[PDB]
Amino acid sequence: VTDRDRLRPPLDERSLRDQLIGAGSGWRQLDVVAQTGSTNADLLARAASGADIDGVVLIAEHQTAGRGRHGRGWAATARAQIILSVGVRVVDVPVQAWGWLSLAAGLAVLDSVAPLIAVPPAETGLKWPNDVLARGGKLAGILAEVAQPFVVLGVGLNVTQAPEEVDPDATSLLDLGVAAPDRNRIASRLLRELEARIIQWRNANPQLAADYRARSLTIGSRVRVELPGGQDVVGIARDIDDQGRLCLDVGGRTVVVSAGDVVHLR
């Protein structure tokens, strides 16, 4: 709606830099751009041209050619989301563990916005592998992409974004009852949470996996998983292994899925 535009002031880049760059913080660079095709693509391109993107933050007020998983997209309107990418050096960490970086990001996003809701409705938490859900709706999507020696982590978080503007299965903080969400405050908390989770991931801290499990909507639920290639597998999600893969119980058999789309069943 056009009235939501009144609920969408621009980000304050200088304030964000003052809060997030300096002693005690690992973020080295932060930029807010008015518009770009894809923040993930932009940081990947910087790394491809030789830039050190570790601890580099890129935030876009609007994103016109957003990327989703598996060649899919991501829709946005100006100032309605927190749209950002960060660079993470990962070569120091065993490749088998890189999948958990993606899970850690979702946890960070959830923790950054969870206290803003008055009362958390049902189906609020993390859906494997990259979904922040609230009231069954997709509140945020996360995309991790590889560019040696880095991983670029992308976050699209619906702040005031109306589902009619982007996707029927979407939701936003505003549509969850948050009357006046402050993107500046939320972005600051998000990046603070993200730094901590990245540090935990790098040092293989057991609390990362523990905190993820505590917020998982998928573990323990009957699920239909749509695998790359189109095949569906129905079972009950039981756990996440040390590679960040989803472990399914299929009639007593174990099926471990590295990638796919999860649908929570009755």
Ligand X SMILES: Nc1ncnc2c1ncn2[C@@H]1C[C@H](CNS(=O)(=O)NC(=O)CCCC[C@@H]2SC[C@@H]3NC(=O)N[C@@H]32)[C@H](O)[C@@H]1O
35 binds ligand X (CB under 6 A): no
Cβ closer to ligand X: 77 or 205? Answer: 77
- Give the angle subtended at the CA of 191 by the CAs of 186 and 196, to the nearest 5°: 130
The binder of ligand X chosen from 161, 200, 216, 221 (CB under 6 A): 161
Say whether the peptide bond before residue 206 is cis (omega within 30 degrees of 0): no
The binder of ligand X chosen from 74, 100, 201, 212 (CB under 6 A): 74
The interface mask with ligand X, positions 84-123, x = CB under 6 A, is -x--------------------------------------
124 binds ligand X (CB under 6 A): no
72 binds ligand X (CB under 6 A): yes
Span near ligand X by CB under 6 A; candidates 21-29, 113-121, 165-173, 184-192: 165-173
Q: 17 CB contacts (<8 Å, ≥6 apart)? A: 30
The binder of ligand X chosen from 4, 21, 33, 68 (CB under 6 A): 68
* Residue showing the smallest CB distance to ligand X in the complex: 141
In order of 6, 47, 74, 187, 239, the CA distances from 160 in angstroms are 10, 31, 16, 14, 33
Cβ closer to ligand X: 153 or 209? Answer: 153
Q: How far apart are the first and last CA of the chain?
A: 33
| Tokens encoding 79 | 């100032």
**DSSP H helices in the chain:** 13-20, 39-48, 99-113, 163-166, 183-202, 206-214
Please count the other Cβ atoms lying within 10 Å of the Cβ belonging to residue 140: 28
Residue with tokens 């119980």: 249
Sheet with 246-250, edge to edge strand ranges: 253-257, 246-250, 232-240, 222-226, 261-264
Cβ closer to ligand X: 46 or 69? Answer: 69
- Give the angle subtended at the CA of 71 by the CAs of 244 and 256, to the nearest 5°: 25
160 binds ligand X (CB under 6 A): no
Span near ligand X by CB under 6 A; candidates 106-114, 120-128, 166-174, 209-217: 166-174
Cβ closer to ligand X: 116 or 205? Answer: 116
| Tokens encoding 86 | 């960060």
183 binds ligand X (CB under 6 A): no
Span near ligand X by CB under 6 A; candidates 26-34, 161-169, 185-193, 211-219: 161-169
Q: Which residues bind ligand X (CB under 6 A)?
A: 38-40, 66-70, 72-76, 83, 85, 130, 138, 141-143, 154-156, 158, 161, 166-167, 170
